[PDB]
A paper describes a structure:
It encompasses an N-terminal domain (NTD) and a C-terminal domain (CTD). The NTD (1-181aa) exhibits an α/β fold that commonly found in nucleotidyltransferase-like proteins. A large central cavity is formed between NTD and CTD.
Similarly, the crystal structures of TglT mutant D82A expressed alone and co-expressed with TakA did not have electron density for the phosphate group next to S78, suggesting that the D82A remained non-phosphorylated in the presence of TakA. On the contrary, while no electron density was observed for S78 phosphorylation in the crystal structure of TglT mutant E146Q expressed alone, we observed clear electron density for a phosphate group connected with residue S78 side chain in the TglT mutant E146Q structure co-expressed with TakA, resembling the structure of the wildtype TglT. The band was slightly higher than the non-phosphorylated species observed for wildtype protein, but was lower than the phosphorylated band. Collectively, D82A remained non-phosphorylated in the presence of TakA.
Residue numbers in the entry: 3 to 292
Amino acid sequence: KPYSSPPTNLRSLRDRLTQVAERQGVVFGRLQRHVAMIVVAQFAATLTDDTGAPLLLVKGGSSLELRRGIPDSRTSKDFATVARRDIELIHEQLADAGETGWEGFTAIFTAPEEIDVPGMPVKPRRFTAKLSYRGRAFATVPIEVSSVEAGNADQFDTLTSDALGLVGVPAAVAVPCMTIPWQIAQKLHAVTAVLEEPKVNDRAHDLVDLQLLEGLLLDADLMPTRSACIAIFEARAQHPWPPRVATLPHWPLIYAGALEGLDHLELARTVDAAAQAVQRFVARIDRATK
Ligand SMILES: [Mg+2]
Ligand SMILES: [Mg+2]
Ligand SMILES: [Mg+2]
Ligand SMILES: [Mg+2]
Ligand SMILES: [Mg+2]
Ligand SMILES: [Mg+2]
Ligand SMILES: [Mg+2]
Ligand SMILES: [Mg+2]
Ligand SMILES: [Mg+2]
Ligand SMILES: [Mg+2]
Ligand SMILES: [Mg+2]
Ligand SMILES: [Mg+2]
Ligand SMILES: [Mg+2]
Ligand SMILES: [Mg+2]
C-alpha cells in the first residue's frame, strides 16, 4: 500500500500523487505544487557556507505550508527566501544543485531579474525553477530571493514534510526557515504599507497569514516579535511602528479569496473582522515587556 521503491518515471509519479491526493482530502494540483516546492526547498538547503550554516532561509507562504501542513494553510504560488550572500553566488549555486538533482528530480533556473522595492537598498530577485523527474518535465515554480534585513537570518527553524515519503521517495526533508517573529514583522509591514501612485496594496491575503502566525506563537513571550517589528520598521524607514491596519476598498473579495479552503479553521470570516484581529495583535506586541 505504501510504495517500496521510488517511482520509475513521471507518469508513475503523477499516478501515485493522485492516489495520495484523493487518499487524504486534497486536490491533485495543490499536492503537486506542494511536492514541487518541497523539491525546490531541498535544493536550497544544500547551499551552505563554510561552517555548514544555511545560505537560504524559506519565508512567506511556502514556510506556512510547511508549518501547518496543506489542509490548514493558504495555497502558496510563490517560493520566497532570504539569502545571507549575493544572488550571483545564490543563483549559480542553485543551478549547480539543480543539475546534480535530488532523488530523481532535476531543475533549471531562469535568470534573475531585479525587481523594485523602495525600502531596501539591495533589490529582490525573481526567477523560475523548471523541475524534471527522471528527465521529463514536471512543474514550474516561481522563486523570490531577497536580502537579509537586521537579524532575520540570524536563526532558523527546520521544517519537514512527509509528502514525498507517501509516494515512496523515502529521503528525509528538512528545510531551514525564517523564524516566526520575523515572518510577523515582514507581513505586518507589508500589510500596512501605502504604495506609490501606479499601484495599490492588494495584500489582503496577508491578514489570513498573520492570524495563522499568531496562533503558532501560542503563549510565547512577544518581546522577540516586538524587537523584530521595531527593527524591520526602522530599517525600511517607510511608515512608523506601531502601524494602523487599514482596509482598502477592493479587499473584501480578495480576503474572501484567501480564505478558500479554510472553513474548518477559526478565522475571521470578513475582512473587517480580520483587520481588527490583526490590530489587537499589533497592540499586544507593542505592549510587550521584559
Ligand atoms: Mg514518463
Ligand atoms: Mg487526486
Ligand atoms: Mg498513493
Ligand atoms: Mg556573497
Ligand atoms: Mg527569470
Ligand atoms: Mg535585529
Ligand atoms: Mg537557529
Ligand atoms: Mg512579507
Ligand atoms: Mg514577549
Ligand atoms: Mg528580544
Ligand atoms: Mg490615519
Ligand atoms: Mg471564502
Ligand atoms: Mg465570504
Ligand atoms: Mg492578540
